[PDB]
Structure 1
């Protein structure tokens, strides 16, 4: 099948440049144009520009002239986009697309997207804190516990509860930046019986800082 494969998330310091691939497979690379598209987290799609792979020829949206340079490498079937002197305004997910055959001018095959975060911040292991209620629960129903990952950079962390068994009634929340450090939180609700009778452990992993932290929920 037709496939476009883009690389994983990149963290880059302001002022530098970032060059990202879109590797093509399953069709004649030279026949179709490759479009590039930007998306800031929670925001809309923005067209960067198109490249004609055999030709080498490019068209840009005014706004990205000077910021984005698109290339092709026929021998690799790999398209590249490079952004120069990056500011945090270039932090975003960037997609490549192949335009469909015909006069269609529509984008039927998409890459997965490559994530760019621009920041002068530095690797920081998360601080995990177990979140226990203040007073004991009444007899009935369910009790909600928590875990609060604070102080990490860059994204992401992965929170799970009791090594993944507990999937029902979890809510891990989107991270929010606080002065170069992310803080997020997870909640877990459980039967009033199981806590504090049983053990509850949040498992917070940060691939970026080489850190895994298993932390147990204690009531007092």
Structure 2
């Protein structure tokens, strides 16, 4: 039951600050050091530092000193990573992680947090159904989906029937539109025989704009 739950994606302005949280549960929070790892484009993975949850003691990677500040709240069992003097190089996925066997390994990780550094404004997505029809059938199967357009920044998450539909789902990486906004598609293959009895809803979440869109996808006569 050990879980590391990170805060949603954020967009911040150049030179400003972002505070990423890591809520721990299923273990005694003060028993294990909390680590922060950065996954930046063309940079692979980088260990930023460790935090002793008992005393707030920290050990930073020199590269992240003065830039990053690690703290924790023992009352809510939440670790925090704050980044200051934000620049394009800080646009990355940030992970919190722990080791439950001394200094042997990182066995538990958070789901990651995408921090975007931009002066541009946050824009919620436009969700359109990709209706199944005779033109989206193949060997007893029917494809359907959702077209998620004109959002900013990344990411948007897509689930189907609130996570109950995962088999045959393909959620594609976003493409960048000429305007600077993003677009993605999410598809699924289902039996073509049960389009009359099954409800297919794509659940689109965009944390920067605090948007949640549930689009029901209905069949068409192509």
TM-score of the alignment, normalized to the shorter chain, above 0.5: yes
Deviation string, structure 1 residues 11-60 (Cα, Å, up to 9, x no partner)? 2222221122334553371x643221112479732100123344543322
Computed over aligned residues only, the root mean square deviation of the Cα atoms, in angstroms, reads: 4.0
- Partner residue, 1:213: 215
Aligned to 1:44: 44
Change (3 A) 1:11 1:142: same
Question: Please, what TM-score do these two structures have when normalized by structure 1?
Answer: 0.69
Deviation at 1:67, TM superposition (A): 1.7
CA contact (8 A) 1:152 1:182 kept: yes
Aligned to 1:106: 105
Specify the structure having the higher radius of gyration (Cα): 1
Deviates more, 1:124-133 or 1:42-51: 124-133
Aligned residues: 213
Distance of 2:60 and 2:171 partners within structure 1 = 39
What per-residue deviation string (whole Å, max 9, x for no partner) do you get for residues 135-185 of structure 1?
7989x6556555433223353243538x98976544332323334322122
**C-alpha distance in 1 between matches for 2:61 and 2:200:** 46
Runs (5+) with no aligned partner, structure 2: none
Give, in whole Å, the separation in 2 of the partners of 1:101 and 1:169. 37
Aligned with 1:63: secondary structure? helix
Residue aligning to 2:6: 7
CA distance in 1, matches of 2:127, 2:37: 35
SS at match of 2:211: coil
Structure 2 residue aligned with 1:57: 57
- The 8 Å contact of residues 97 and 111 in structure 1, kept in 2 or not, is answered as yes
**Under a length normalisation based on structure 2, what TM-score does the superposition of the two structures give?**
0.68
- Where does structure 1 lack aligned partners over 5 or more consecutive residues? none
**Counterparts of 1:54 and 1:45 in 2: how far apart (Å)?**
27
Task: Answer yes or no: is 1:156 the counterpart of 2:128.
Answer: no
Identify if the C-alpha distance between structure 1 residues 68 and 164 changes in structure 2 by more than 3 Å, giving closer, same or farther: closer
| Matches of 1:33 and 1:202, distance apart in 2 | 43
Correspondence for 1:203 among 195, 201, 209: 201
Q: Is the 8 A contact 1:20 1:80 kept in 2?
A: yes
**1:123: how far off?**
2.5
